[PDB]
């Protein structure tokens, strides 16, 4: 009963939600995050 | 004596290290005059260790102690007498007054972890005391009042 | 998988794929302590008699293991960048760098704040790094991750505490088991229905 | 010290108990050294709520009052009809 109609219209995963949360940010690196403290 | 601080390290039995340290400082008497007083400072640790800090000041006066009694034997004495009186302070004044014999062993400081958790009775009656006065904390600034620092040995406990 | 299977450090031998003992066990503490409850990180790891005279050659490896469990939460997080750079460095540890760092982040927020309902940021900032602001915003992205299960305040700068499972959270768990359980037998009752 | 009362306040308790509030919190050592049990006083607010200790299910209260209101209606209906018999007995 393939529905069709609509073709008109870990390894490599499961931690793409995790890098995607910190893929703009982790800039810093944490090391830099560590020396914002010293400048704090 | 190896066979002493082999079954002390355990802590399983400290009953059988006291016999090995005796019979090594009873041979070390005359033939090993330098050895005997550091198994002599064991057999008094395991006296206190094994919770009769009394037979401590028992042992330093018998005469086969009286030859090497000095400010070490002193030291194992006053620490008997804190575990004793269950005092924390007591034990911290005997540890800060006799720097020497705090760097060999540091089994007394296990004692002084099992002495917080002795006084956590009294912080029982602390958190007791909204039941009966909350004052202060009743967690922090009023437990046997002293330091604010005693956070974090109840939230080492608390995990 | 790993630190379960890393189990084996009394009989290493002397792998030519270990670079040394000593880096399999520099292995074994770094992927223990990330997957490794605290009953079981004193159990094997700080009360391990093979790891301990191993740790004993390295100071700061010693240090970063002894800092959580001692609950000394200012010296790993500077240990843990000094973790993050040889984790980059080293080859079969650079790709789950992030992820390693940030998961320790989360498992040292998660420690603290389980001993204490209310906690001012303050004395989170002490604890760890000096500066407040960045406290509060890992707090607020791993609060958002759903990780750090508590709640922040502004203002009054006080973090709270989450629901604990055992106390209501065991219905939210016969919930969860029970929609996937649920959806099954909705599906399968129309294939012989039909 | 027990009571019904809820709301008495604690430092009267103290003044009742003829010990000093300053000293109080060392004079209810004193209980807790008795270990009567805690009925409960709430100091932040200065008053003993010494009415119940450690609170259980109530499933007894709704169980007992439930056989005895039922029980005293019976109890009332089998002394009904002895009475409504009396002025059957006049009528």
């Not at chain 2, 005059?33 to 037979?55: F, G, H």
């Not at chain 2, 600034?141 to 620092?149: H, N, Q, V």
């Not at chain 2, 956070?151 to 406990?157: A, F, G, N, P």
Request: glycine share 2%; aromatic share 10%.
């Amino acid at each position: 009963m393939s529905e069709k109609k609509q073709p008109v219209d870990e390894d490599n995963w499961d931690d793409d939600n995790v890098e995607d949360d910190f893929s703009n940010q982790l800039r810093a690196e944490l090391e830099k995050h560590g020396y914002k403290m010293e400048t704090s | 004596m190896q066979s002493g601080i082999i079954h002390a390290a355990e802590e399983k039995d400290w009953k059988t290290a006291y016999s090995y340290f005796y019979e090594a400082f009873e041979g070390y008497d005359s033939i090993d005059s330098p050895k005997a007083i550091t198994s002599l400072k064991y057999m008094l640790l395991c006296k206190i260790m094994l919770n009769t800090p009394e037979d401590v000041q028992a042992l330093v006066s018998g005469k086969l102690a009286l030859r090497y009694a000095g400010r070490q034997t002193e030291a194992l004495k006053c620490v008997a007498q804190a575990s004793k009186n269950r005092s924390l302070a007591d034990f911290e004044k005997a540890l800060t007054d006799y720097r020497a014999e705090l760097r060999d062993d540091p089994i007394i400081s296990t004692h002084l972890a099992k002495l917080y958790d002795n006084l956590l009775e009294q912080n029982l009656i602390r958190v007791i005391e909204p039941f009966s006065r909350v004052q202060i904390e009743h967690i922090s600034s009023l437990i046997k009042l002293s330091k604010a620092d005693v956070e974090r040995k109840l939230s080492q406990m608390i995990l | 998988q790993a630190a379960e299977l890393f189990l084996d450090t009394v009989s290493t031998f002397t792998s030519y794929e270990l670079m040394d003992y000593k880096t399999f066990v520099t292995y074994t503490v770094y992927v223990s302590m990330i997957a490794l409850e605290r009953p079981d990180l004193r159990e094997k790891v700080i009360k391990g008699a093979e790891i301990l005279e191993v740790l004993h050659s390295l100071p700061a490896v010693r240090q970063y293991l002894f800092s959580l469990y001692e609950c000394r939460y200012s010296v790993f997080f500077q240990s843990l960048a000094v973790v993050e750079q040889e984790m980059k460095k080293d080859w079969l540890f650079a790709p789950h760098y992030r992820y390693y760092v940030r998961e320790m982040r989360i498992h040292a927020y998660s420690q603290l704040l389980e001993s204490y309902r209310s906690l001012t940021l303050g004395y989170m900032a002490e604890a760890f790094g000096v500066g407040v602001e960045f406290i509060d915003q890992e707090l607020s992205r791993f609060i958002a991750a759903g990780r750090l299960h508590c709640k922040i305040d502004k203002v009054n700068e006080i973090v709270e505490t989450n629901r604990p499972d055992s106390k209501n959270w065991q219905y939210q768990e016969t919930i969860k088991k029970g929609d996937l359980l649920l959806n099954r037998v909705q599906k399968l009752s129309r294939v012989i229905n039909m | 010290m027990a009571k019904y009362y809820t709301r008495i306040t604690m430092k009267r308790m103290a003044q009742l108990l003829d010990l000093s509030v300053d000293e109080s919190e060392a004079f209810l050592s004193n209980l807790v050294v008795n270990k009567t049990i805690f009925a409960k006083v709430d100091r932040l607010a200065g008053i003993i709520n010494f009415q119940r200790p450690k609170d259980p299910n109530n499933l007894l209260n709704d169980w007992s009052q439930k056989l005895n209101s039922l029980m005293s209606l019976v109890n009332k209906t089998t002394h009904l009809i002895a009475k409504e018999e009396m002025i059957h007995n006049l009528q």
